[PDB]
Amino acid sequence: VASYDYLVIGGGSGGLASARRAAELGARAAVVESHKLGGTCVNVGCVPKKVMWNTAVHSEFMHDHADYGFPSCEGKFNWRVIKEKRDAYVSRLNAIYQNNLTKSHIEIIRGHAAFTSDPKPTIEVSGKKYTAPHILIATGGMPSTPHESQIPGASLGITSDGFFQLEELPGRSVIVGAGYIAVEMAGILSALGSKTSLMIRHDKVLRSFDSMISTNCTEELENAGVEVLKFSQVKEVKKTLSGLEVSMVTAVPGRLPVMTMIPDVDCLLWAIGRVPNTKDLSLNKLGIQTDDKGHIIVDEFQNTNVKGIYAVGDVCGKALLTPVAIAAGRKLAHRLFEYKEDSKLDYNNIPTVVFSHPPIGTVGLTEDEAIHKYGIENVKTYSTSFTPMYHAVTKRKTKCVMKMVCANKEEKVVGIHMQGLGCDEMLQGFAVAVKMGATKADFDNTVAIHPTSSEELVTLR
Amino acid sequence: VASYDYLVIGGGSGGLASARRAAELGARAAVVESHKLGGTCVNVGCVPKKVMWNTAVHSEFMHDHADYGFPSCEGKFNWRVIKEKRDAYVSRLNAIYQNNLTKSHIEIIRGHAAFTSDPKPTIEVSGKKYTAPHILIATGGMPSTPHESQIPGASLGITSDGFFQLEELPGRSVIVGAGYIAVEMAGILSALGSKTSLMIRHDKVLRSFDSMISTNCTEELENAGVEVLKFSQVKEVKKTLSGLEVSMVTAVPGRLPVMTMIPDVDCLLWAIGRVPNTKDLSLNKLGIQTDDKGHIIVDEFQNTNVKGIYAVGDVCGKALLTPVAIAAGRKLAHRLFEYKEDSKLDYNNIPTVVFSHPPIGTVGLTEDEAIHKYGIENVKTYSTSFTPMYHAVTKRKTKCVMKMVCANKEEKVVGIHMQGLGCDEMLQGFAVAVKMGATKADFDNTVAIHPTSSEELVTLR
Ligand SMILES: Cc1cc2nc3c(=O)[nH]c(=O)nc-3n(C[C@H](O)[C@H](O)[C@H](O)COP(=O)(O)OP(=O)(O)OC[C@H]3O[C@@H](n4cnc5c(N)ncnc54)[C@H](O)[C@@H]3O)c2cc1C
Numbered sequence: 001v002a003s004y005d006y007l008v009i010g011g012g013s014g015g016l017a018s019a020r021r022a023a024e025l026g027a028r029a030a031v032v033e034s035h036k037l038g039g040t041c042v043n044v045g046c047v048p049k050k051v052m053w054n055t056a057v058h059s060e061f062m063h064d065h066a067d068y069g070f071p072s073c074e075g076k077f078n079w080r081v082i083k084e085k086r087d088a089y090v091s092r093l094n095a096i097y098q099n100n101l102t103k104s105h106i107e108i109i110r111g112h113a114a115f116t117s118d119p120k121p122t123i124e125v126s127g128k129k130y131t132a133p134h135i136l137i138a139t140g141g142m143p144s145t146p147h148e149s150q151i152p153g154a155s156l157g158i159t160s161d162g163f164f165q166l167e168e169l170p171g172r173s174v175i176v177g178a179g180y181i182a183v184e185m186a187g188i189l190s191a192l193g194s195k196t197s198l199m200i201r202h203d204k205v206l207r208s209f210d211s212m213i214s215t216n217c218t219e220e221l222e223n224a225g226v227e228v229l230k231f232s233q234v235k236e237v238k239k240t241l242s243g244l245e246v247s248m249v250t251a252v253p254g255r256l257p258v259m260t261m262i263p264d265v266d267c268l269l270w271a272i273g274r275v276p277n278t279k280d281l282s283l284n285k286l287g288i289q290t291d292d293k294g295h296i297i298v299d300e301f302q303n304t305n306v307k308g309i310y311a312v313g314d315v316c317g318k319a320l321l322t323p324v325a326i327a328a329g330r331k332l333a334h335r336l337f338e339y340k341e342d343s344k345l346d347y348n349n350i351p352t353v354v355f356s357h358p359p360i361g362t363v364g365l366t367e368d369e370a371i372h373k374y375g376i377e378n379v380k381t382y383s384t385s386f387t388p389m390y391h392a393v394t395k396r397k398t399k400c401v402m403k404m405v406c407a408n409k410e411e412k413v414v415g416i417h418m419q420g421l422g423c424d425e426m427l428q429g430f431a432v433a434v435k436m437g438a439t440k441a442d443f444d445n446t447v448a449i450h451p452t453s454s455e456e457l458v459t460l461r
Numbered sequence: 462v463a464s465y466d467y468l469v470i471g472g473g474s475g476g477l478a479s480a481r482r483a484a485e486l487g488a489r490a491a492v493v494e495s496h497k498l499g500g501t502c503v504n505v506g507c508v509p510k511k512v513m514w515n516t517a518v519h520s521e522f523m524h525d526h527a528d529y530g531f532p533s534c535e536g537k538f539n540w541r542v543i544k545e546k547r548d549a550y551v552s553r554l555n556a557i558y559q560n561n562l563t564k565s566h567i568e569i570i571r572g573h574a575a576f577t578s579d580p581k582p583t584i585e586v587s588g589k590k591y592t593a594p595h596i597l598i599a600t601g602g603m604p605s606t607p608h609e610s611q612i613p614g615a616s617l618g619i620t621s622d623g624f625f626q627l628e629e630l631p632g633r634s635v636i637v638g639a640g641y642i643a644v645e646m647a648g649i650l651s652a653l654g655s656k657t658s659l660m661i662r663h664d665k666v667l668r669s670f671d672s673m674i675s676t677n678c679t680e681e682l683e684n685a686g687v688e689v690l691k692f693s694q695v696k697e698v699k700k701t702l703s704g705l706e707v708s709m710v711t712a713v714p715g716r717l718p719v720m721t722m723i724p725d726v727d728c729l730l731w732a733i734g735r736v737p738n739t740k741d742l743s744l745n746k747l748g749i750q751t752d753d754k755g756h757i758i759v760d761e762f763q764n765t766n767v768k769g770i771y772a773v774g775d776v777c778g779k780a781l782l783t784p785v786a787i788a789a790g791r792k793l794a795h796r797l798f799e800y801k802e803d804s805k806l807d808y809n810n811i812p813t814v815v816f817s818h819p820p821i822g823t824v825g826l827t828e829d830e831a832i833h834k835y836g837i838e839n840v841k842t843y844s845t846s847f848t849p850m851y852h853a854v855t856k857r858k859t860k861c862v863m864k865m866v867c868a869n870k871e872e873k874v875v876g877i878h879m880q881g882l883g884c885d886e887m888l889q890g891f892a893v894a895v896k897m898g899a900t901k902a903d904f905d906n907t908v909a910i911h912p913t914s915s916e917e918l919v920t921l922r
């Protein structure tokens with residue numbers, strides 16, 4: 001059996017980040033990947049999603065062209081064109097990167113890995129055994145789809161994975177879900193020309209976000225032309241002559257249930273959650289702990305319940321973002337190969353951007369979370385809403401809302417929430433300030449940059 | 462004679478800001494304006510400039526419309542259309558603000574103001590004399606134009622003031638200057654279709670900015686189609702049958718000087734600097750101190766050399782920005798009506814954005830300034846350059862450059878400099894962090910937001 005200092009299962013964001021840092025510290029490592037190196041981020045997540053978002057934004061530009069003094073443009077979008085360019089970009093990334101694994105002298109093991117019953121930490125790929133005193137599980141996850149038994153015909157729908165396989169613009173789309181992936185997909189499809197509906201179980205999207213964001217985002221979706229079907233769930237899906245027929249039940253509180261048949265649907269996209277990839281790792285052979293969802297259980301140092309075995313990224317079910325998987329992986333490498341016992345990722349104040357229209361930026365606690373932690377008596381919030389200057393000459397409008405959540409006497413900034421033009425690139429710097437424990441005084445004592453939307457955050461009344 | 466509790470000369474950003482708050486604090490102030498209320502910010506500066514920049518940005522992105530999968534869009538810009546909408550927008554702004562002015566009860570005196578003798582601070586406007594225990598001078602400045610004795614025919618050219626009076630797109634434009642106003646005007650004109658040249662005295666633009674920015678900005682201007690005329694100065698201007706003829710002398714080090722006659726110029730714009738408005742204030746009658754340039758000298762509390770008289774804004778020649786004039790003005794009305802010996806604007810680490818293409822963001826010290834203040838041995842810089850993923854599918858390209866200047870062993874961040882897409886809305890948050898005395902560790906400890914350009918600043922190595 002081949003022996004290494006570090007074995008990483010999964011060549012995605014978390015695995016590659018941890019493997020490369022370990023190698024820089026001298027560790028002899030190998031990465032096991034059953035599919036495409038790069039994982040979800042480059043192949044069916046972050047990167048291709050952003051390219052499609054940039055495309056959707058270009059559609060918004062086409063619409064304001066006349067208002068800005070130019071002759072109107074046609075508007076016939078060609079999905080095939082961007083699809084081909086997007087695929088080429090992903091190919092370049094996959095190539096330019098594989099080179100990095102080579103430069104780091106990290107061995108790549110192609111195939112599906114599974115733990116062996118060997119008393120010593122050992123895995124098997126294809127038919128060969130590999131071992132090491134340190135083994136990292138970074139297998140990520142996958143999109144969740146309903147069972148045929150629960151919702152007959154569910155298999156007729158696609159997920160975000162299928163979204164990236166599309167070669168043409170669906171004429172009519174129905175997205176099921178209220179999370180950020182559901183919101184991003186609905187926004188992109190609608191902006192590019194698809195007659196889009198977003199089906200949600202309650203009254204608003206992004207219910208885990210601050211109330212202001214949940215409310216505002218739902219309203220902007222409706223203003224953009226996305227039909228938000230509230231308190232609705234899919235009961236059945238059936239193939240028709242034109243496409244698919246979606247049977248929906250709407251149960252609004254205070255009203256009676258009603259069934260609706262949505263016809264002529266070209267694309268039914270399920271965006272109801274993610275499930276971890278742990279089913280076939282033979283975790284039981286070592287007694288590796290997981291929850292009833294399949295997530296690997298870990299402590300603050302990413303240790304599983306078994307010595308010498310760790311886990312990071314989507315597989316653990318906490319803060320499912322690329323930079324998080326990367327940071328957790330690198331912090332672990334320093335702990336194991338630089339012997340920094342205190343090296344770990346701080347999961348507090350992790351910033352996130354949702355690429356909606358306009359984009360959302362948030363970091364820290366929501367107003368409700370702050371109230372629960374410090375007591376309503378010790379929480380003070382500042383907020384504002386305005387129409388960005390960009391829309392001064394356009395008929396089409398979007399608004400910008402910002403909220404600052406402060407705690408205690410010194411009004412420590414414990415949360416920042418916003419949606420509006422430019423919020424995607426505006427958040428990072430404010431996140432650094434929040435991580436530093438900035439107070440509102442720190443914000444107010446920073447001179448504003450005029451004229452921008454960002455200056456509103458340092459001039460809150 | 463008319464008497465008030467606070468007299469303010471100038472109805473601009475610094476004047477209105479101080480007076481408006483003065484009224485708020487229960488003060489009894491009045492403001493004298495010889496021209497349009499609001500000042501440079503709303504009439505011939507910040508706001509209208511940004512509307513024109515947004516228009517230019519629109520035009521630039523639309524050149525990538527076909528690359529993003531849409532049918533090519535023509536680009537015959539109609540200047541008159543935007544001019545009218547811009548004027549209307551400014552009108553709505555003045556009205557909204559005017560409602561807040563009359564609300565705080567502030568007497569507006571029309572006419573050119575000028576000081577008189579009197580053993581006590583007194584001013585006369587159109588024959589009528591006014592006075593008060595506190596007089597604020599906030600007359601701002603104006604564009605500088607060469608004297609006919611120096612450059613014959615110089616009066617044939619316009620300045621930024623005239624730029625905002627333009628009702629048609631000049632076919633051929635020549636902008637003279639290397640500062641940010643010159644850079645912004647050249648970029649807007651060229652983006653909108655004018656055959657544009659930018660004449661500078663040396664090799665690069667923005668020489669007072671960090672070397673990386675000066676170099677990069679000059680290159681981006683050339684890549685955008687702006688002809689940068691280096692080591693060149695205007696000697697004479699003459700009216701011709703088809704516009705203007707600009708006589709220029711070019712003297713590149715190592716080469717022989719040469720005379721060039723630029724024909725068929727439709728618009729010659731002087732952007733060689735600004736001078737303070739104090740030539741007709743008769744401040745000599747009261748011994749008010751000024752420098753050789755005409756700037757009113759003041760201390761940290763904006764006090765002139767004559768008790769009871771203060772000055773803020775562009776007229777003082779330091780940090781010529783709207784938020785600085787506003788803040789200094791508020792901090793003053795604060796001191797004179799709140800009694801806080803420590804109340805004054807901190808002029809350190811003021812952030813600024815230059816609306817070039819792409820935009821520039823900077824705060825803190827340049828690498829050279831830091832090297833001189835801390836010593837080469839105590840300064841370390843981190844920098845990166847990349848092509849934003851927005852261009853992954855476009856033939857046209859712009860780059861993004863970022864530089865972090867650190868000082869001493871803890872690597873305190875004393876400067877951040879960058880140019881690229883989104884940098885205009887990206888800077889504010891980082892400025893808050895720098896003002897807080899953030900170190901590189903603080904930046905690196907903040908989790909990145911992917912995929913964005915802003916995350917590159919927290920992952921520099
Ligand atoms: C549509 C979509 C949009 C998103 N947008 C964003 C965004 O804008 N920003 C952001 O920060 N995050 C975003 N995310 C989330 C981000 O992509 C994930 O958090 C990140 O990819 C997780 O990294 P990971 O390393 O845990 O797993 P993954 O990158 O999924 O990698 C796990 C790898 O392990 C391999 N593997 C699994 N089992 C085995 C085995 N037994 N043997 C060998 N190899 C195996 C897989 O094939 C895979 O390559 C998005 C996700 C989706 C789905």
Ligand SMILES: Cc1cc2nc3c(=O)[nH]c(=O)nc-3n(C[C@H](O)[C@H](O)[C@H](O)COP(=O)(O)OP(=O)(O)OC[C@H]3O[C@@H](n4cnc5c(N)ncnc54)[C@H](O)[C@@H]3O)c2cc1C
Nearest residue numbers: 471473474475495500501506574600601774775781782783
């Ligand atoms: C083209 C251009 C673009 C700019 N872009 C930006 C930008 O994007 N961001 C930024 O922060 N800054 C920008 N600035 C700078 C900003 O506009 C100025 O810093 C700010 O307006 C200065 O405010 P102020 O109150 O000192 O003077 P001003 O606003 O110039 O006001 C002085 C007022 O006093 C009046 N006045 C003068 N003399 C007398 C007198 N004797 N009696 C009565 N009234 C008198 C004037 O007519 C005027 O209205 C720009 C400037 C220009 C020229």
Ligand SMILES: *CC1=C(CCCCCC(=O)O)C(=O)c2ccccc2C1=O
Nearest residue numbers: 012013016017020038041042093097322
């Ligand atoms: C998110 C992403 C990935 C997955 C990577 C984590 C790799 C980390 C490391 O080495 O520390 C890529 O593989 C990749 C490749 C080229 C360009 C962009 C990207 C990504 O954004």
Ligand SMILES: *CC1=C(CCCCCC(=O)O)C(=O)c2ccccc2C1=O
Nearest residue numbers: 473474477478481499502554555558783
């Ligand atoms: C820059 C600006 C100005 C100039 C003024 C100072 C106003 C300050 C204060 O009273 O506190 C405006 O007058 C104005 C009016 C409406 C909308 C925007 C603006 C500006 O950006």
